[PDB]
Amino acid sequence: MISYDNYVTILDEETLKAWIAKLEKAPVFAFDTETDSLDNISANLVGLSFAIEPGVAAYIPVAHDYLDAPDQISRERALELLKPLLEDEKALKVGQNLKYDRGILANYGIELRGIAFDTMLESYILNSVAGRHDMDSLAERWLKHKTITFEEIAGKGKNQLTFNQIALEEAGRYAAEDADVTLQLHLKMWPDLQKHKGPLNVFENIEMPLVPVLSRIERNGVKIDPKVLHNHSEELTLRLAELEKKAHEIAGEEFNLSSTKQLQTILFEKQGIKPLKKTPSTSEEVLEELALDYPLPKVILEYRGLAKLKSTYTDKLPLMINPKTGRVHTSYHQAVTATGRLSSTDPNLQNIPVRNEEGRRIRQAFIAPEDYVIVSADYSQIELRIMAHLSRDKGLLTAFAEGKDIHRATAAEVFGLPLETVTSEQRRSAKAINFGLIYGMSAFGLARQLNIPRKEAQKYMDLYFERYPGVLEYMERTRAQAKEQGYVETLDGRRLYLPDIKSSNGARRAAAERAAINAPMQGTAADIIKRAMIAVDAWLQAEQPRVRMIMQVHDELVFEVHKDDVDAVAKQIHQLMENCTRLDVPLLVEVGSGENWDQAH
Ligand SMILES: [Mg+2]
Ligand SMILES: [Zn+2]
Ligand SMILES: [Zn+2]
Ligand SMILES: [Zn+2]
Ligand SMILES: [Zn+2]
């Protein structure tokens, strides 16, 4: 049990200064902040904690304001004394999710530097799939220690206290422990992170440097027009009502638009084969097949899609506008995906329909402020370019080299015809093959997505490998090492461990084999994207142009650029992204602009 004896609670300047002197001479030290809210931009700093040595940590309360709270060093006074140490790049800090802390300090005009180690990222790089990378999971896994939970000191539910309401000593136990455990986690993980130069490279030159740039992107936020979203919502209400009628009219009587309940009784009772369509989903979607002739499955399908879209983005997004900035601040997660790509929540920018018009209207609500424009920088089919590289296939490589449509170039080879004559259907077949190879799909899967008979798909795949031998060889070679070393790597050294690579369980070992093939391409795309963000942010920081990096979604970086600077800036972003990241993968950056994200997209 952590008691009040473990860690000191600093309530006087003299003591704070004595600690600052020790921190200044420490090789590294844990740093952590506590606030009155999870919302970074509007959160108020309530206290700070530090750990200079395992078991030696302190909590410095500055804004606890409960009834009769003891005198504390003022927030302004503690920060001005701590500022030098915090802004000193030579003073190395260790922390758990330093992105958050860096942000809090920015609310006070303090630029946290010396952001050297993030235990969350140390864990994530050691083994992205070992388990959760939050401090509590980490303490238990590496230290066989159970940390004091936030709920344990603040309570639960709507009546949960905010940190400023917690007693100084209780808060200190929690906060000082955070710092102490963080330092101990570091001391155990950092040595380990050195058994391999690949992961070490990714941690050092990619993950750690990205910490402050993610903070700036999140705190910058994005401008959303709540009027547009609202009109969209109202229109969606009217369209949903109409579709309900169109469905009723195509059939008889009223009824809900739910399968395996009301739909199967209409759809099939009036002809059609019995198996219902599960929302499994992207492998045998019964409703969408029928859609080619049967009108009911078509409107029901469109009904659900719009209803889901309305409640997820049209009705939620406007509620996410932060009253303090008038903008929306998405949460990027740097240590969640198995492959290394950044994830996003509230909102999940990546789940906004890409090839759909309604998705297009959602994006139209993402606007540029007055006298600025939204600029979108996209890495054209970066994963396919990466597979071309990893497979050393002169064919694909040449196709990209001469600027040809790889799907049409591929079709021209698989189907044997001039590139100019390749039809839309052949392009669509090659495209499915290409992107199927990335996710390591089966000839049968290709068929279930192409609506052709099995072995007809197998035919297309055998033709592809004959013409593109390098891709099969890459695949066979990748699955080989996956079983040999238990993991696959990206170009920069990032690893994906594959525990079920020998699962004995067919389904599991199947999955592990698909991940083996995919991770290297998806992970490398991610590494490239992260390196670009770092390079672009560095230019932004150094030159201070009139541009803000506001989003990262899929393989694109989105900015706000002043209308009078678009040309010079577009050129610069372009050169940074395709010429200041990896020089081996043939990269192409497509840059666009407009009044909103949809226009620039
Ligand atoms: Mg191909
Ligand atoms: Zn903490
Ligand atoms: Zn992609
Ligand atoms: Zn996109
Ligand atoms: Zn270029």
Side-chain angles (χ1 to χ4, degrees), residues 1-275 280 285-601:
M1 184 94 302
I2 289 293
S3 70
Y4 309 127
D5 303 340
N6 297 71
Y7 313 114
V8 65
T9 300
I10 301 170
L11 265 27
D12 73 277
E13 280 187 31
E14 174 184 52
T15 304
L16 207 216
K17 285 184 277 196
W19 269 75
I20 289 180
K22 289 188 305 184
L23 265 359
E24 277 169 0
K25 49 202 171 203
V28 289
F29 61 82
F31 168 61
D32 183 37
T33 66
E34 302 295 345
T35 70
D36 63 5
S37 165
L38 282 168
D39 182 55
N40 200 90
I41 201 65
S42 68
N44 291 296
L45 176 67
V46 164
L48 314 93
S49 74
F50 295 82
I52 20 185
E53 208 175 291
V56 187
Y59 177 56
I60 311 158
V62 303
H64 287 257
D65 52 18
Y66 51 95
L67 184 273
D68 294 314
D71 293 326
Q72 299 151 62
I73 301 179
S74 67
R75 177 162 54 215
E76 294 296 291
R77 177 60 175 156
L79 287 186
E80 92 179 319
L81 281 171
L82 255 3
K83 181 158 180 168
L85 177 73
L86 268 14
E87 304 196 318
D88 182 354
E89 58 166 56
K90 308 229 182 240
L92 315 174
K93 298 82 178 183
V94 189
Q96 171 76 29
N97 193 24
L98 244 28
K99 178 186 62 177
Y100 182 82
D101 302 295
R102 181 277 165 188
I104 301 301
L105 292 172
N107 288 330
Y108 301 95
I110 294 180
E111 276 284 8
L112 206 234
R113 302 208 176 76
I115 305 182
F117 306 100
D118 194 314
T119 54
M120 181 184 72
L121 300 174
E122 294 180 341
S123 177
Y124 187 64
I125 295 300
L126 245 25
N127 179 354
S128 65
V129 297
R132 293 179 60 192
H133 301 103
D134 58 292
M135 199 196 104
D136 288 57
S137 301
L138 292 184
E140 184 159 21
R141 191 179 312 146
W142 297 78
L143 311 185
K144 283 64 185 61
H145 175 236
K146 293 179 175 176
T147 49
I148 299 167
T149 62
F150 185 73
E151 291 61 47
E152 279 168 39
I153 53 161
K156 288 173 184 174
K158 296 184 61 181
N159 273 338
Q160 184 182 66
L161 298 174
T162 50
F163 220 76
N164 60 102
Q165 308 183 104
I166 305 180
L168 266 39
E169 295 298 293
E170 278 306 308
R173 294 176 59 241
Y174 176 89
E177 177 183 57
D178 281 350
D180 181 31
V181 163
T182 295
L183 184 56
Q184 282 177 54
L185 282 174
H186 168 70
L187 266 14
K188 282 207 172 190
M189 291 192 291
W190 179 234
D192 267 26
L193 252 180
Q194 310 211 41
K195 303 178 183 299
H196 307 93
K197 342 299 241 249
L200 193 283
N201 167 64
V202 177
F203 172 78
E204 287 208 304
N205 307 125
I206 298 182
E207 300 306 341
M208 286 313 302
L210 190 74
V211 173
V213 350
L214 274 199
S215 177
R216 286 187 279 274
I217 292 177
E218 294 190 351
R219 293 172 53 75
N220 273 163
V222 67
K223 227 291 191 59
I224 273 181
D225 190 326
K227 300 193 308 78
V228 174
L229 264 359
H230 184 62
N231 292 330
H232 192 179
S233 190
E234 302 272 47
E235 183 200 297
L236 285 173
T237 295
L238 285 163
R239 284 173 60 185
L240 287 168
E242 274 271 9
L243 283 162
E244 200 178 311
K245 287 176 179 174
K246 287 197 170 181
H248 289 170
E249 191 199 325
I250 291 184
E253 84 204 282
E254 281 63 77
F255 70 126
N256 284 298
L257 297 296
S258 63
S259 58
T260 44
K261 255 311 307 123
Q262 298 279 279
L263 299 186
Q264 53 184 355
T265 51
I266 303 289
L267 295 167
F268 312 122
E269 145 265 290
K270 70 176 182 181
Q271 190 172 62
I273 314 183
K274 39 237 171 178
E285 233 308 304
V286 180
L287 303 180
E288 56 187 62
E289 265 83 280
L290 300 163
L292 288 306
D293 16 61
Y294 294 65
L296 185 56
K298 178 176 139 88
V299 320
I300 295 166
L301 206 60
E302 217 248 23
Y303 181 75
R304 295 176 179 169
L306 289 183
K308 173 202 64 62
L309 196 84
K310 175 174 179 292
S311 70
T312 302
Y313 292 109
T314 300
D315 299 348
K316 296 284 191 302
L317 241 27
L319 278 26
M320 300 178 163
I321 298 175
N322 186 306
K324 199 172 189 185
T325 62
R327 295 169 66 91
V328 175
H329 303 271
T330 175
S331 299
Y332 283 98
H333 307 257
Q334 201 178 348
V336 158
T337 65
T339 60
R341 272 183 182 285
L342 294 173
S343 61
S344 172
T345 61
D346 304 285
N348 186 333
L349 266 22
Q350 299 191 303
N351 283 351
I352 296 174
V354 191
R355 273 193 166 186
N356 179 350
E357 157 108 296
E358 298 310 294
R360 287 192 52 185
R361 286 184 61 188
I362 291 302
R363 291 191 244 94
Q364 281 167 37
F366 290 63
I367 58 172
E370 188 66 44
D371 291 337
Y372 277 74
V373 292
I374 293 304
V375 172
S376 183
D378 180 57
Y379 276 114
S380 306
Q381 49 223 179
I382 185 170
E383 292 196 349
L384 233 39
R385 290 173 174 269
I386 293 173
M387 185 186 71
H389 177 84
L390 292 186
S391 65
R392 304 142 192 203
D393 192 285
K394 174 164 168 289
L396 302 180
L397 251 17
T398 299
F400 285 124
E402 28 208 39
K404 304 197 303 176
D405 185 316
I406 28 78
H407 295 124
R408 297 189 82 241
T410 293
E413 285 268 61
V414 176
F415 297 112
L417 66 162
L419 184 70
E420 314 99 72
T421 65
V422 48
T423 72
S424 292
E425 189 200 65
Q426 303 174 319
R427 199 203 111 112
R428 173 169 50 264
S429 294
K431 182 165 184 173
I433 293 176
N434 280 334
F435 290 130
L437 294 168
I438 290 175
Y439 294 98
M441 274 298 137
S442 58
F444 313 116
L446 190 234
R448 307 203 86 201
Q449 315 303 297
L450 216 51
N451 283 336
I452 55 177
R454 315 162 177 178
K455 282 56 182 302
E456 140 86 311
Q458 179 70 56
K459 183 191 187 300
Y460 296 168
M461 300 195 102
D462 304 325
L463 275 160
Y464 184 100
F465 290 133
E466 188 199 319
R467 205 97 299 91
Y468 299 109
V471 180
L472 216 202
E473 294 178 57
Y474 155 80
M475 299 181 107
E476 301 182 301
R477 171 181 46 161
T478 295
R479 309 212 304 291
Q481 347 212 268
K483 281 178 169 57
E484 157 77 334
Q485 43 188 51
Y487 71 77
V488 296
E489 302 183 289
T490 65
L491 271 54
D492 274 292
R494 167 178 238 110
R495 301 181 185 185
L496 168 57
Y497 284 77
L498 306 162
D500 293 334
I501 188 68
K502 290 189 192 193
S503 180
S504 88
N505 182 302
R508 291 171 88 199
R509 200 177 69 234
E513 288 176 296
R514 274 179 271 118
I517 289 169
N518 176 265
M521 299 176 283
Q522 187 155 34
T524 302
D527 292 333
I528 292 174
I529 290 160
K530 292 183 173 177
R531 291 172 63 157
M533 289 171 76
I534 292 159
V536 177
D537 175 82
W539 161 60
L540 255 36
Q541 291 293 286
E543 276 355 281
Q544 225 59 255
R546 291 191 291 190
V547 17
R548 282 200 287 216
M549 185 150 53
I550 64 176
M551 297 182 274
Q552 194 296 112
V553 59
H554 292 132
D555 314 307
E556 81 183 290
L557 295 187
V558 189
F559 312 72
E560 282 184 350
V561 181
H562 196 283
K563 64 182 183 68
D564 302 323
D565 306 330
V566 192
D567 295 340
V569 174
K571 254 196 62 180
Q572 183 63 188
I573 299 292
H574 187 78
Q575 296 203 336
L576 288 174
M577 294 181 68
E578 57 165 64
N579 307 315
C580 300
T581 305
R582 296 195 66 83
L583 295 175
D584 50 348
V585 174
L587 306 171
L588 171 64
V589 175
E590 231 86 281
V591 181
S593 59
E595 289 310 317
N596 56 65
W597 186 20
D598 179 59
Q599 279 183 47
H601 192 78

